[model samples]
Target chain A: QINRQYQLAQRPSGLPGRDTFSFVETPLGEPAEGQILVKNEYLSLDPAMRGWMNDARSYIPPVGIGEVMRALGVGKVLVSKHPGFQAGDYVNGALGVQDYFIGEPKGFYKVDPSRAPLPRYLSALGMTGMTAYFALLDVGQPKNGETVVISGAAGAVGSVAGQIARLKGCRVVGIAGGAEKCRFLVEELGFDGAIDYKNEDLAAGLKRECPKGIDVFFDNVGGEILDTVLTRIAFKARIVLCGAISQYNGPANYLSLLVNRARMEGMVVMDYAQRFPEGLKEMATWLAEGKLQSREDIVEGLETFPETLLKLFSGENFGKLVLKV
Target chain B: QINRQYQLAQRPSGLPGRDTFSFVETPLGEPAEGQILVKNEYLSLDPAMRGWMNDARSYIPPVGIGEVMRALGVGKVLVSKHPGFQAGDYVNGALGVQDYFIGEPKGFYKVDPSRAPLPRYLSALGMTGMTAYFALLDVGQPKNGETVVISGAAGAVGSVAGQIARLKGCRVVGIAGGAEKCRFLVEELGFDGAIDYKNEDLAAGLKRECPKGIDVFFDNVGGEILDTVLTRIAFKARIVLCGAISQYNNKEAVRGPANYLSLLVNRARMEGMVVMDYAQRFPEGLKEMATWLAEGKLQSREDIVEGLETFPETLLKLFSGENFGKLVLKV
Candidate 1:
């Protein structure tokens, strides 16, 4: 009879709160020509969410106030007005933060629900997966025996990206918060080591973990961590600038690049959207073979949208965070 | 009977002073096998020299304390034991901050005295010119009609590099310490715009000079100038880090470019380069530079200061923005 949705109410300067989004129940809309009605299943909670909330220049446009919050979700097609999509089809796309998604479904594609859990699709088999896969392999390009440092190493993207680095024969060292997450990176994910940034000194940890110097730094969290890592980069080191969850908002030894003859470049997940299938194919095989773990943290209910996202910045949630609608 | 040289007496924390170098006279030695002795005529006073004095990690090793301060110079071969070199031939090599360079003449190449003046060889035709030429083209890679910005543009390397970019049809803007140097960049070198950081606010000046955003920023002065330039960088911009004249004297700490995230926002590249990397291909560089100069399109200014004893004071001119163009020491 109705739909429950979270709409952008105001832009945030720091960590987003309840005032950032407006939760309301409205009459459910039906599918039109070249459109489909989707019953939303799981919404991906990512570090990129903070960037989207800002009125800043980026690869994509910001969601306007009073409009439904933009989010990536896995859902089922309840009604289809398009030839390619069937009524029983399962899909993944920008389904917004809602119980019902009504749109043209541009850049949307079908996924088999039976192959993996719906939450896993949003975690390791969706945009979160596509981001870690190509951004690490293509941008970071870690060679065998090279030391790879990943910041925010226990989060959705960093966790997946670190595993991929280890599989590529790299000695991966992860930087994460708390002993459990750092311990999980090494004990569970098979990383060479982990830096407990919250407990220990980042510089001291980096010096001990990366005695030979950092060859590849897959940055998820920026600010102080980025500047500290800049001091220890090896010659020709490639820093993949993926996210700045810390600043939402900043790498100011940049001079170290000059001393080491290195380079620091940016990586956007959408830049590799064209080759998602090929990336998904390889990652999916590794996941099925038990070599890669697709761990997910699913928070329940639609009303807990604003509060649930805060867990990400607070370091409360572990692994790929997803919301069950 | 003897040779006079400037030795690193004490590493200064800021600008080098009289206490920084020891002016000494020492006995000379005969040439060993595969080595030669050269009487230095002119020593190159370059921004790169500042980095060498500090005990810091760089492309090349730092100048050791109590050692003859390392320098590049043009000189006449007084004695030659090497098969390829002649006794009367003039050459360009690491002649040190001394009257005579006595050692194996590694990377030493002969230069004709008839081609150019000895001091000019140390300026546009030598390390300074080669750095300005190759680092701009190979690293910056500014395409025609694109906007190229240069800091320290009144300096030898910046001046030459900006002129070359203009020749490539780039809209060149120079950021210098004074209004005079900024004016010289626009009027003398034909740069489209100028930013006088000494008088004008860098951010405001950059926005005004480069409305479309900077495509290639040839940064010679790093510190705040680099940070300001980063903010206006366009998509796929390339920042060439040839020298950081401002930060070279900061002892150990280097001011990081605060606005570096622009590199991420624009998906840009900030790469460092040393002139020695292109040492094997200097002939190709000298040919194009010489040809450009012969055509009167390229102009190289030399701010020659006399006396080897003035090495400590003359070197300070670079950091203070007192010396203009290619500062040379007449040894």
Candidate 2:
């Protein structure tokens, strides 16, 4: 079988472009002792991918030059020599941007495709779900009467996070890019208020929605939005720094923590890997009960990976942008 | 008796000047029921006084136009009709900027002058002392073996805070303006290292001194200094936002911590605290501070200026790094 993979060509200065990756094709190797080969079915495109491209000190090491670009994917186990896995056992892991994965499968976890659709595993039942779960419930720590505001609220993790805040009895407000996303947040996700940051003034929107001040701010998009939200934080507020998609290529102003007597904390979902089962159990139940909904903006073919990934940076993807490889 | 008072002349755009206050002379009122007459001995000059001048949202209301400029002072009660206080008692309270005070003796606390000097009450055993004690211990939460850094290290609160960190068995570093102040920090105050912010580059100084990264940052001078420290904080570091003396006079906006992403990467937290929130625990803090003082683990320094008329100019000494220690104006 032929395996097609995308390798990092060079680090881009700003938003990554066409020449950032090199598409290559190679023949697949057999699964050796204590190893499994996964046929990547769907590739999950995340904002954190931009951060991994930079040569800087971060939570994880940078993607080295000429290395297969790091990606998370849902795949079907076609071959296995390990005792825990067998053929046809679907799994999810850091499978990279390739048509096939040939590795030790050390961190791979099996998922039953019979329980949920494969793309759903990449959305509500996957890393995005766990990120929204722990980062909100654990880091944000929303109270019953508290007002919770979320930036990038219509995106993959944010859409689920707002509903979870609503579930916790918080007054939830969402800040998104357009009228459609804002409407989606308020109408479909049950968020109390929505701010179209692309059209409306963020400061005025925050004033109108969070009149009592934001108690918990789950920030996905950073930069100016993060700075503007800082001006309206309540005393002892918690700002969960989930991801700074806007600032992945820039910087942010964090003086608001000092003035508000609040704290802004960074959280990486990978740190909560040990407790993934607990989050998945709850999320799975939520999905089955129709309480939590999962949406994926799927694009066909592995060849379209380069352009499909760019949809996330340009805010073209309405939901979780997954590549159907 | 005649009372000499300085009233707020106008709200200042930046720093208060000689024109900011109007000196007035009035007949002293007699003590009424539940009241006391006090001869103001020393008025405390603090950085927080500048914030009180502006009409904005803050912990306390702004000093009203034409009202006596708010001040905390040490006084001797000459006459008392209040059940809580007696005549000849040395007290500390909001005595305002005046030669004599005649008002309800509410929120006033008595102090023993024989135990330590009266000015020491204002420096080590009073508000400044309470501020350093609670803000450092309660907010900063410096642990043994941790590296604690303090800005404005030669100033009242910073000096005391550095000594407290030393007593806690932490490697303490101080950031000050001049060579003299920096030397005082390492030699006199026993800080592990001192950074001369005026002469040396702060980023390089922090890199050299805080090789292990900062565990707790007690920030008093909050501007570029604060932003620089944020870049070098250790994992799970606690930054106590005590005061921002650097931006007190400037019209420029506060420089937001651009590297605050460090807080997230390190799982650190920056928290603000007002000393008034720890008032109930002051007696306990004062007792511990007194013990430290007796053991020579803590030292109190008072920079006294003669005459209450020098209030505006003396207050400037703190911002300019001229005050050697706790600034007190003698009335």
Candidate 3:
């Protein structure tokens, strides 16, 4: 078998372009004493991948130069040498931007693809869903009738988070980049109100819609929008910091959170390491009960990985972007 | 009858000098149908008196210019036309800076001077005691064995507060201006540690003595000290803002709490408290405190500067932390 992979060419100054990633093909090795050889199927493209490209302190380490660009993907096991796994089994792991992977499968786990599609595991039933569940419930703690305002509302985690808030009887409001994403959040995803950041002003929209002020602010796009929301936070409000896609490029000073007497806490879902099984089990039940909604915006082929990953930076991807290798 | 009175001659610019007050003799009036005439004995000199001098929005209105400066005093009911009080009974009320008062008896309540000294009723068994008790218990909420830090620790409210924290089984720390007051906090007041803020750095003192970090900071003096305490607060710390004496004289806009993010990082609370908000629970606090005093479990200290004419200079001693304990004007 062969492994077709994308390698990081060089770190970009700002936004990574088409030339930042290069494709390479190599022969796959056999599974050794305690390892597995797998053929990759679906690759999860995330905004956090932008952070991993740079050498900095983040939730995880930066991807090494000239290495296969790190990614979370689902794969079908072709050969297994370990006692727990067999040939032709399906699993999920950080398989990178490759067609095949040969590793110890230390962090990899078996998934029954018969229960859900490969893309569904990447979007709702995978790490994305776990982030939304833990961040909203543990950190945000939105009560029934309380208002929760989310930035990047139409994105993978924000989309599911708003729906969960609605399920808990909260007044959910979403702020997306465009009118279309705003519409999807309200009409398709059942958000109470949607602020189109592309056409309208965020602070003005918040002043009009959330006149009572926001009780919980789940911030993903943290620049001027985060500063705007700071003015409208209620007393004893909680601001959960999941990702700051706006500030990932360079040093972000951001606004001070002193006046409102509110809380701003940073969360990495991986830190809920001990309770992830319980979290995933709960999220899976929510997906099965039709209470949770997830959309996979898939792009086909390993060759499209370079351009598809850039879609997140340009706000072009409609939902959770996945690559079918 | 002649009434000895002190009136606010003008609004003070900085600290009130002698010119700011005017002592005059006025005719005492007969008690009206709902009025009780009181013979005032001890007047409570408080730091809140500074805030009452300003014309601004606050929890209570400012003491109007040319009016009798507002105060809490212990007095005897010389004559009572009000049904709630009788002649010869001692009481506490908003009787102001006068030897006698004739007003509607609505807010006045009877006090037993026999429970302790009349000044003790005003200090430990009175409003000051009630303030420390409620603010610490209800707001600071210090857990037993937790370190409790009180600023202005040698003053009326703060001295009482440190002991009350000790009574609740806490490791109490006091921050006072002078070394003498600091020594008194540890030796006499039962505080585990004390910081002489004038001599030692507050942050460093906190670090050295309170190795576990402060769990409850009962702040009566807010300003740079409050800012310093914010740096050393432990996880889930509660900052009780009872008064801000340090910032009271600032002509500029008050320095907003810059280190308030400590609240979020530590998962803590910074709460403002007014003693009058606990009016319903004052009796409970006073009863328990009085019991402590009667049982010798608590000590009452008073700094009585004799003569009513010395009120202005005696009041200045409070701002300077010159007075040793509950500074009272003996009339």
Candidate 4:
């Protein structure tokens, strides 16, 4: 059998597009001593991938040139020499953007395929779920009856976060790009209000929706939206800087923090890795009870990796964009 | 006796010049019930006065047109009807920019003339002292062995704040304009390091002085200096937004901190605090500050400028970095 992979061809200047990755095929290697070989089932396409493409200081290192593009994936163990895992077991790890993952399973965690679908593990029950859970609860610290405003509301992490805010008894308002996404937020997801940022004026929408002023702002799309939301923050508001998907290509009028006596804080989900089990258990319970909802926008085939990744930046995907290999 | 006063002639667009105030003389009025008449001795000239000049939202109301230019001053009660004060009692209150103060002495607090110099009431042992004390101790929260950076280091509030940082066993650095003010910060004020913002590259100076990065930044002069300090802040740094002397005149679009992402990266916070919030606790603060003053651990310098007429021009000295110390108008 052979392994099909996409290697990083060059660093991108802006939003990454075609020609950024090079598709290649290689013969699959056997699992060595204490190593396992797994076949990739699904790849989690995330906005943070763009940040990893740039050679800069971040939570993790950038994918090196001529290397299989780094990714988090759900796979089934085909062969296992390690005592921890065996063939026929499903696992989730940094399986890279390839058809087969062959290595010692360092960060790999075993998943029961019977409990949840494979893509659901990559979405609500995985890192995306954990990111939303900790970043909102730990950093945002949304209080009950407080006005919690979230940017990029229709996206994966944001959608789940907004729902969590609702579960916490917060008056949750979401800011999204189009009418369809905005409707999905308020009509389907139970958001208190939704602002269509692309069609309507953001400032006016924020003023109308958040009359009490934002107490906690879970920011995903940064740049101008971050600056706009800053102007309407309540005194001592906590701005959770989870991911600047808008500014990952490029940078806010931060002085509003002083005017309102608020704090804009940054949070990386990986920092909360030790407590993932706690977060995952709570999220799993919520999912089973239908209190939390997870959605994945799946794209078929490994060949469409480069094009499918663009859906995240373009805001084309309705939910968590995942590549089905 | 006649009372001479400077009323707000017109609101200023930029820096207050010759036409900002209307000088007038009127017969001294008698103290009514609950009122105390005071002969103004020294008026506290402050940068906050410029903010009070504008007709806008602030901690306090703006001085109305034809009303007395609001000021904090040290004075002696000549006639007292209020039971809280007596004749011949020295006091500190909003005496306004006039030779005599006649009104209900609501916020007035009695001061002993023999305890400390009158100007010190407006300086290290008074509002300025309380401002630095609570702002540094409460907001800045400098820990022992931590690096504390202060802007407008030779001024009334900044100088006192730097000393308190030193008392707390923190390494103190001051950013002052001109070589002389910078020298005074190190030599006279005992600041561990001084950055002459006028002659030196502020970024390089900061990198050299605060090698471990600024843990507590007491910012008095905002604008570019505040933005620059944001770049060098350490993990969990506390930035106390005390005053913005740099942006007081002809306001520019406040350069929103572009490097503010550093706040999230380092887990730092910038907070604003008004001194009036700490008024009830001022006596305790004053007692502690007075002890430091008596031990010569803290020094108070007053630059007394004569005449009530020179108020507008004398106010200009603060912005130019010409006022050597606590600016006091000898009324």
Pairs of colliding residues, candidate 3: none
lDDT tens digits, residues A25-87, model 4? Answer: 999989899999999999999988898899875557889999999999999999999999999
Clashing pairs in 1: none
Model 3, stretches more than 4 Å misplaced?
A1-325, B2-27, B30-35, B64-67, B104-108, B307-310
Model 1's DockQ?
Answer: 0.56
User: What is the per-residue lDDT of model 1 for residues A126-173, given as tens digits with 9 covering 90 to 100?
Assistant: 877778888788878899999999998888888899899999999999
Give one digit per residue, the lDDT tens place, for model 2 in A1-325: 7999999999999988889999999899998999999999999998889988999888789999999999999999999999999999999998999999998897789987877899988999888888999999999999999999998899999999998999899999999988999998888878999999889899999999998999999988788888889888998899988877644672223445655667777788888889988888888888888887778999999998788888988889989989999
Local lDDT at B186 for model 2:
94
Q: What share of the true interface contacts does candidate 4 keep?
A: 0.33
| DockQ of predictions, in order shown | 0.56, 0.48, 0.10, 0.36
Off by over 4 Å in 2: A250-259, B30-37, B79-83, B102-107
Q: After aligning candidate 4 to the native by TM-score, how far in Å is the CA of B244 from where it should be?
A: 2.6
lDDT tens per residue, model 4, B147-216: 9999989999999999999999999999998999998999988999999988999999999999999999
Please provide, for model 1 over B259-315, each residue's C-alpha lDDT reduced to its tens digit, 9 standing for 90 to 100: 776776787878887777788889999988988988999998998899988888788
Cα distance off (Å), candidate 4, residue A258? 3.8
- As a whole number from 0 to 100, the lDDT of residue B273 in candidate 2 is 76
Better of 1 and 3 by TM-score: 1
Best candidate, DockQ: 1
Clashes of each: 0, 1, 0, 0
Query: Could you estimate the TM-score for every candidate?
Result: 0.95, 0.95, 0.66, 0.89
lDDT of 3 by residue, B1-331 (tens): 7887889888887788888889889998898898999988888898888888877545578888788888898889989998889999999888888788888975677888777899887799878888888889987887889999999888888999999999889999999988888998899878899999899888889988899988999988777788789878887688877777886666744554445445544556666667766777777878899898888777889887788777888888878867777877777
Model 1: how far residue A138 lies from native, Å:
2.6
lDDT of each: 0.87, 0.88, 0.82, 0.87
Ranking by DockQ: 1, 2, 4, 3
